[PDB]
Write a protein that binds this ligand. Structure first.
Ligand SMILES: [Cl-]
Lengths: 214, 117
């Protein structure tokens, strides 16, 4: 019967970038907008509702107000392309497209959002010039929680104080700042490494204590 | 605005022998004047295969897969004529409401086992 097909069942998008996911549907002649219906949703939230050749924005979710849109140009070629700007963690999940055009079908697209600790801000402060004690600070945002490893150019393991808090700018993002107090000489190099946790669910086994054998 | 429940895809495990026919049942309560019911095969690697739908257009389907409506209008039979050993796997049915509002609900996965003769 009428079948909607999807080129990529999975998209991996960088946090803060723009993504465009596509759903294909059969077109053998001129696109008849009056009989065409296009529906985009994610976690029971309406994203795009295209009916009678026009986009119905009344039912659209607040989260996608002025950042989501359907590419009209691609529709004539039989391509339902959803473009979302400024992708956040909340945009990570399972999307669903529905197409009605002389028949009806729907497909599923998994979207993954990666928020790395790749925007690292640093600061260097002299605490005491007499003892040449310095204070080094690294900060970055991402998900999930990250620990900071301080190493010298000798790659010796150093211990600093790390503070992890929620990001004020965007929800569900962790702001990670670490501070190291150390006496050092000029032009020596230090490294702050942000080790992140698995962005996938952890695995757990349940253990139940049995009766004591004879 | 009357809420309705997701479709049921019974049996959860259908076991038939190759050469015979297998039939699923997709049931739900329709409050829609215009609606479609589709049949998907969900295999690993993320590929979703559309087998049949109601109403039937002709659209070119495998013909071994067809979806037919029972007289009561609430139960639908997803049939496979002469099931192959390669027909094993997980299958789902979904419903598309267009008339009252645009909403989509999908049934649970149902495993189909095709045993040798
Ligand atoms: Cl047929």
């Amino acid at each position: 019967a009428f079948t909607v097909t999807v080129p990529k069942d999975l998209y991996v998008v960088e946090y803060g970038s723009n993504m465009t996911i596509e759903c294909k549907f059969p077109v053998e002649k001129q696109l008849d907008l009056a009989a065409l219906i296009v529906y985009w949703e994610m976690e029971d939230k309406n994203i795009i509702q295209f009916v009678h050749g026009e986009e119905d924005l009344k039912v659209q979710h607040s989260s996608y107000r002025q950042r989501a849109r359907l590419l009209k140009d691609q529709l004539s070629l039989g391509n339902a392309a959803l473009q979302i700007t400024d992708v956040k963690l909340q945009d990570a999940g399972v999307y669903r497209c529905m197409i009605s055009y002389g028949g009806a079908d729907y497909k599923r697209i998994t979207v993954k959002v990666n928020a790395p600790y790749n925007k690292i801000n640093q600061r260097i402060l002299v605490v005491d010039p007499v003892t040449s004690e310095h204070e080094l600070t690294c900060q970055a945002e991402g998900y999930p929680k990250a620990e900071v490893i301080w190493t010298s150019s000798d790659h010796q393991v150093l211990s600093g104080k790390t503070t992890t808090t929620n990001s004020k700018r965007e929800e569900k993002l962790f702001n990670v700042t670490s501070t190291l107090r150390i006496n050092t000489t000029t032009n020596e190099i230090f490294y702050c490494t942000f080790r992140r946790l698995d962005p996938e669910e952890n695995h757990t086994a349940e253990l139940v204590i049995p009766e004591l054998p004879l | 605005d009357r809420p309705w429940n997701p479709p049921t895809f019974s049996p959860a495990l259908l076991v038939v022998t190759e050469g015979d026919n297998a039939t699923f049942t997709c049931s739900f309560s329709n409050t829609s004047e215009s609606f479609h019911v589709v049949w998907h095969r969900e295999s690993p690697s993320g590929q979703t295969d559309t087998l049949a739908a109601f109403p039937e257009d002709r659209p070119g389907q495998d013909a071994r897969f067809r979806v037919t409506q029972l007289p009561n209008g609430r139960d639908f039979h997803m049939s496979v004529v002469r099931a192959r050993r390669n027909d094993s796997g997980t299958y789902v049915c979904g419903v598309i409401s267009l008339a009252p509002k645009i909403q989509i609900k999908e049934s649970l996965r149902a495993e189909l086992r095709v045993t040798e003769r």
